[PDB]
Write a protein that binds this ligand. Sequence first.
Ligand code: UF5
Ligand code: UF5
Ligand code: GLU
Ligand code: GLU
Ligand code: CL
Ligand code: CL
Ligand code: ZN
Ligand code: ZN
Ligand code: ZN
Ligand code: ZN
Ligand code: ZN
Lengths: 264, 264
Amino acid sequence: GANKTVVVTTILESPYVMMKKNHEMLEGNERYEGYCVDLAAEIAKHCGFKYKLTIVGDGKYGARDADTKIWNGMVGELVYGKADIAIAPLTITYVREEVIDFSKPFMSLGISIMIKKGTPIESAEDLSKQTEIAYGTLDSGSTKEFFRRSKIAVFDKMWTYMRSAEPSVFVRTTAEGVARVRKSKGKYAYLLESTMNEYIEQRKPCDTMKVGGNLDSKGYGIATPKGSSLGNAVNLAVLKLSEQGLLDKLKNKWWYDKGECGSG
Amino acid sequence: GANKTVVVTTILESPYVMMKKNHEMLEGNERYEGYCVDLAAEIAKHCGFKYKLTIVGDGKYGARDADTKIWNGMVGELVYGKADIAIAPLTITYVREEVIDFSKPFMSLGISIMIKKGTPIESAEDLSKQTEIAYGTLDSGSTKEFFRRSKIAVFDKMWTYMRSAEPSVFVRTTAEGVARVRKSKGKYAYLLESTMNEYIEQRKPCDTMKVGGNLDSKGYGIATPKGSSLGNAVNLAVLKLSEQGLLDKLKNKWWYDKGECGSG
Ligand SMILES: O=S1(=O)NCN(C2CC2)c2cc(Cl)sc21
Ligand SMILES: O=S1(=O)NCN(C2CC2)c2cc(Cl)sc21
Ligand SMILES: N[C@@H](CCC(=O)O)C(=O)O
Ligand SMILES: N[C@@H](CCC(=O)O)C(=O)O
Ligand SMILES: [Cl-]
Ligand SMILES: [Cl-]
Ligand SMILES: [Zn+2]
Ligand SMILES: [Zn+2]
Ligand SMILES: [Zn+2]
Ligand SMILES: [Zn+2]
Ligand SMILES: [Zn+2]
């Protein structure tokens, strides 16, 4: 039938989607800025739709409750028909691709380690062989599920520690994890995606660092409900923006051009 | 109908698919070894099909002739019904995704520069701003099409040079490009995918190296004819094997565990 405004679910996560400084005097999509705000505008332009950015109600990326089988987060908003598309740092995973569609990836990432500068940690293996430095991940996200489901030796060992550690090593938001690194005098390391790690590394007070290689290799995709008619066009739009260099331009714009820790 | 043997198109490109040293005494799929041979066996087992590996008849990856509009290479074998699936270092691109389906990527790559050691080149900009050192790409591939289509100034300048260079700077096979680097005393640099560059860097005589950053960021996907009933299972299998670490293991097996230029 007639064209309808597309409901976009997304998540407040720097530098993907942020409230503008003067957001309180702005309306609708103009309240927000960031990589995914720019990406949404480009996708909509190339696919020919109007859209409304909405922040995911529960603040979560998306995981399935093992007892009720109900999906939360942005994934749930797609599954249950509350949003038409998710444009966010939403990680492509097997279990999610069973219930929603993902475009080809628009950004690469892997799980990585954030330390406060000077922490004597260089790798996941180092973390797994000590207990002085606690370490954890974000809840309801792909990083936690990676460790939970993993049968890889070192990652299995880390999960056995994290799931039982008291007090909890898990956090509800990326910001909470970063703050915990910064205020723990080196006694907490945060496991998070390399994209977010590398962003924070270039933000004041310039006291965190990514260390070691990434633990895996995956990416973020634009997600739609299974079988949605938007999926085909959105997938091609991602590939076009990739081939034009726009994804590279936007990454530089939001990570490094704005960097606060020097011109390195 | 009854299950039928799946025809896999692939290409002789090291270390993805190679003839075994004793292949004349072997039959069928056993004649071949390499990363994509191993991957094909896993994809087939996880999706529950029998398969036959076949080497693409024309030795090409896939490009559309601008006049006849016929697709050649592995893409053509899928488009015209000669093969059911491609399991090969076949690059995801916009123009290909319009006519065939790609799985989520099973390996990352970007266009990169191969030099003979000691060549005074550190970047694509360096190449573009001089004339003593020639440079070119493979034929009928995604790297050539990237330069042909690029609107980025440095890459536009490089294409303007390469398309008019005489004698031709393009090569028919990767081996021809590498041999040209090795015999040109530093006066030829080869533009090829980082995966193949890194592999050759670890092969005797250890006289080439990858220099500079990559020029773009993309990946290889398993390709099927548009609308194939195999695509969904293959896509989920790639993601499962990615999460379980298979892809990282196979990359190390065929690139680095067998490297001939030291334990660097
Ligand atoms: O989760 S994936 O779709 N597949 C796994 N990989 C690795 C190259 C193998 C990947 C990289 C992206 Cl960038 S997105 C994805
Ligand atoms: O050609 S893609 O499907 N999309 C573009 N990218 C870049 C992360 C943006 C990518 C990486 C892969 Cl690995 S596969 C692909
Ligand atoms: N991008 C992740 C959230 C961050 C994390 O889990 O580290 C997801 O889609 O679940
Ligand atoms: N992987 C490329 C071939 C190699 C290249 O173009 O550098 C393709 O699919 O066309
Ligand atoms: Cl997941
Ligand atoms: Cl192409
Ligand atoms: Zn406010
Ligand atoms: Zn655009
Ligand atoms: Zn519950
Ligand atoms: Zn376990
Ligand atoms: Zn297997």
